[PDB]
Copies of this chain bind each other. A is one copy, B any other.
Amino acid sequence: EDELRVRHLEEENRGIVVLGINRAYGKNSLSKNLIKMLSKAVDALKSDKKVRTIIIRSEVPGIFCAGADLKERAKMSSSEVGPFVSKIRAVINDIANLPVPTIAAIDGLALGGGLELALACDIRVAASSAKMGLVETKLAIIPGGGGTQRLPRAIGMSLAKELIFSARVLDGKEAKAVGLISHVLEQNQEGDAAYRKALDLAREFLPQGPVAMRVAKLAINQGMEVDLVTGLAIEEACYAQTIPTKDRLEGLLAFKEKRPPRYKGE
């Protein structure tokens, strides 16, 4: 539908792919079709061994993602609501599990599923003028795209509760103050400052061992959700996977030869 663009950058950004939501007519809302294409694009990247970092952003200035489509929802029977919402929770969850580092570039409004999708990314950067929040309670529903789990985990229980309870919408500076995002930018004339920073942060990842980066992610994500001792065992298991890699040795042969390693993900 062209509503979702999957670009593979080059040159200086080689190794970076970008997922851009282009559906201004719907405020980039999650229509039953946009999640299909999203779910489709996500599975594709799951196995894409070339990718080293993934940026998720919008190509519609002023808007990141307004969440689920109110229009379609009001035309859904109760027995259909649950299934559709769970579909969104699952795609958002697959995104949280992408193999490489993920960065959400919020240059605009990010509500409900929009922020939940961003919460699924490893890192979030946003313009100070961007607005985000989970307003589900004002509609007598609750965040249904993982938000009740990821928000408390990212900023703490007390603040995640207050935001969800008051269904308050924060701006870039506020989100930054509560830790919702790790970098607050000054919006530029093209309305893509968050994206530029994300790209910049991404390049910063490109020079590392592809295999080490992926298992580092796995150790962090998996370990945080089990007791520390099991987490340590998981760290050992991920570390073991970097040992028989050419890259491990290429790393050593690069510093001994005083030269930038040329990792291949092997």
Question: 1/0 contact trace for A142-169 toward B, CB 8 Å?
Answer: 1110111110111011111110111110
* Cβ-closest chain B residue relative to A216: B142
Q: Whole-angstrom distance from the CB of A113 to the nearest CB of chain B? A: 12
Kindly state whether residue A9 has any CB partner on chain B within 8 Å.
no
> Which residues of chain B come closer than 8 Å to A158, judged between CB atoms?
122-124, 154, 179, 182
> Which residues of chain B come closer than 8 Å to A243, judged between CB atoms?
78, 81-82, 141
Copies of this chain per assembly:
6
Q: Are A142 and B233 in contact (CB under 8 A)?
A: no
Q: Which of B73, B138, B220 is within 8 Å of A164, CB to CB?
A: B220
* Cβ-closest chain B residue relative to A144: B239
Q: Which of B89, B122, B208, B265 is within 8 Å of A232, CB to CB?
A: B89
Q: Which of B49, B205, B221 is within 8 Å of A79, CB to CB?
A: B49
Kindly state whether residue A237 has any CB partner on chain B within 8 Å.
yes
> Which residues of chain B come closer than 8 Å to A188, judged between CB atoms?
none
Q: Which of B82, B137, B182, B234 is within 8 Å of A213, CB to CB?
A: B137
Main SS at interface, chain A: helix
* Cβ-closest chain B residue relative to A182: B158
Determine, out of A13-21, A24-32, A255-263, the stretch whose residues face the partner at the interface: A255-263
> Which residues of chain B come closer than 8 Å to A162, judged between CB atoms?
122-123, 182, 201
**Contacts A79-B266, A85-B239, A124-B158 given: A165-B213 contact, CB under 8 Å?**
yes
Give the 7 A-B residue pairs with the shortest CB-CB distance, closest first.
A140-B209, A237-B237, A140-B247, A139-B251, A148-B219, A225-B227, A137-B208
Extra A-B contacts (7), CB below 8 Å, given A142-B242, A144-B239: A86-B236, A137-B208, A138-B208, A139-B209, A141-B243, A148-B223, A149-B220
